[model samples]
Target chain A: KNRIFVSSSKDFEGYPSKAIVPVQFVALLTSIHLTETKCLLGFSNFERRGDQSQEDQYLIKLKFKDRGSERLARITISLLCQYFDIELPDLDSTVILRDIHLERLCFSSCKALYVSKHGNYTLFLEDIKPLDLVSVISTISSELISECDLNNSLVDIFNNLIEMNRDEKNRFKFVKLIHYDIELKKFVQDQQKVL
Target chain B: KNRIFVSSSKDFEGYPSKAIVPVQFVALLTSIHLTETKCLLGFSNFERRGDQSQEDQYLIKLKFKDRGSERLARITISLLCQYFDIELPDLDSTVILRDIHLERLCFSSCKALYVSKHGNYTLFLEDIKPLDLVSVISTISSELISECDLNNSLVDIFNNLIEMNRDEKNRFKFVKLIHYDIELKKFVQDQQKVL
Candidate 1:
């Protein structure tokens, strides 16, 4: 019974939500074809989820150097919002990255976690469960697309955006993962392995 | 009586079915504080209007470069679309600029031409229309907002975009002017004097 869940008494089903950067990072990891890649999964609201369970989950935050990342974040979230069947509100992205934790979750192994009530609801080895398509998860197609028309409109936009990524000469590629996705230990240890 | 109207149409009741960009350009002129200030109005379709009459009150194409003049165009046309209760679809903005033209006419001189053989419609141009009110045209309201929501969602996104201007910013603001409208000469002469 490898079923996964939010560990709440009741699930927040049918709610419109998104996590673009992490989702894109996951997509990028999958794209890169790395043998052993790692992604940092972070979530919000462990403080509230503390009374519920001791499952392993972690709160995460990411930072980028330039305003281009803001545009990337906007486009990515806009794309992801289309997937979730949600209307992407025009958000002050500065508020988003400025210490405001978006409501979200992570998908990672229960190898390690911070042992504190503050970082509650992590997926421990016991809590780690199999991916369930219908019950605990929603894909881009099933979640976002309520009708054929919205589906057609969103797919056209998504395809066009992805197509744009295809034409340009990308400095990054799937065959190369020596430069991406590292664990905290490996990130520190890989200092000697540089070209 | 002041009323909204298409070029060469005496009636204020013509539907702005395919006239978003032209009207937006008109609004742009307004935004640059061009209301009564040394305006130059010219149009070719009007000449065609009194003659061929079937040319479909279309805007003649011309171009110019003034960054301060752009916000008005963006907001006013968007507001005009709002008046019609439609989501103005994002056209290829570059293609749009490449295709539209304007005649220099002050608000007072804009004729309520009845180009539509069907009937007459006119649009009112009050003494002066404000940028803030025009920008707020996108807001959903039960009544014309007494105190405007300065924090309207689309404003920042729009403002940031409008701010990006350089000497070479507009490649084709005045790309190709088709002087089919006989009134073009006098207006160009007036505009040349102003320049």
Candidate 2:
């Protein structure tokens, strides 16, 4: 499964055009890099800053995943900095790594909008809201429609998402207003026709 | 003593005037705010994002201190987001909190630069190098020169810092070229005149 991060609060730094990040977080990233995990979409903050590809950043974000691996003699801020040629702040330095809120999230192209009992996608859905979450499944439905992965599955993740809410009263349920989009609904109708 | 943080590894996020931060880091900020500790210079990644006063940020930083207090029923990405009004990624979201390599650091306006036997300022120095670290002590010497804090103190944190290295062979030492800044040296000379 692919992993992703959502930006929280939306607060950020730099006076005119610069940024800052926590020292530990930098170590954490280096650790992630060392491990080479599945995904890292949001928190990979920097795209580039006219500096070296490895260093010269206030934040770091990643794109392609399941690639590139390395080893760490240890988990020291010093070593990590040398690896990326970056600087770090003192832990007791009183700096606050207040950028985004992090949590656990994973999705498997659900057949419906109702959350998993284990709460696999709660934060993801809550962070954006049911509207976009639904829209997300619908959006991913493209690949689902193009090529079925769970072949012979009893349910469709995108289609089942429609049953998540009928009553517009719930905050996560956006029926009367959120369902305003027509193309998406019609696209769902066209699904059967294509099949 | 005031607390401060250093930015590590220079790498960072966003494209063309934008930013992003981590979720736990945001909680870290809110937690710091809750207890209201000493300092938080480097990692406060965001100044502001053109959004809400409380929320709307990719990174968050603070200026004033010992002024605010709050409570936490718990520490969840949800609660942190509600407090900061931010969102979050999955803990296992395959995202990273990279940017700065964090570590513990604290300084008492030291009297020398050989490095604390206890390692208070080691990371801070290592991150920037002895040149700037010396400069930082000298620059901060202004306050030491203007007003005396540790009354009847025999040694000067800045002056002792000059003694940190006499040999130019060592990395942290600045015997020949490293001690090139004249204004600062002259400033040190002027110290006795003022006294």
Docking band of candidate 2: incorrect
Writing each residue's lDDT as its tens digit, candidate 2 over A1-195 gives: 222121211222211132221111111121222123321212222222212232212222222221111000011222223223333443223112221112111122211111123322211111211112243435445221323433222123233323323324312232343234566456545663255
Error of 1 at B173 (Å): 39
TM-score of chain B of each: 0.23, 0.21
Q: How do the predictions measure up, each by TM-score?
A: 0.18, 0.19
Query: What is each candidate's fraction of native interface contacts (fnat)?
Result: 0.00, 0.02
Tens-digit lDDT string for candidate 1 (A1-195): 112222221232321233111110010001100011221223222222333331222332121223322222233233222222233333311112211111111122111111223323222111111112131222323213123332232233223223322435423221232322344124223431221
Among these predicted structures, which one has the highest TM-score?
2
lDDT of 2 at A176: 40
**Candidate 1 CAPRI level:** incorrect
Prediction 1 global C-alpha lDDT: 0.25
Name the lDDT value of residue B39 in candidate 1.
16
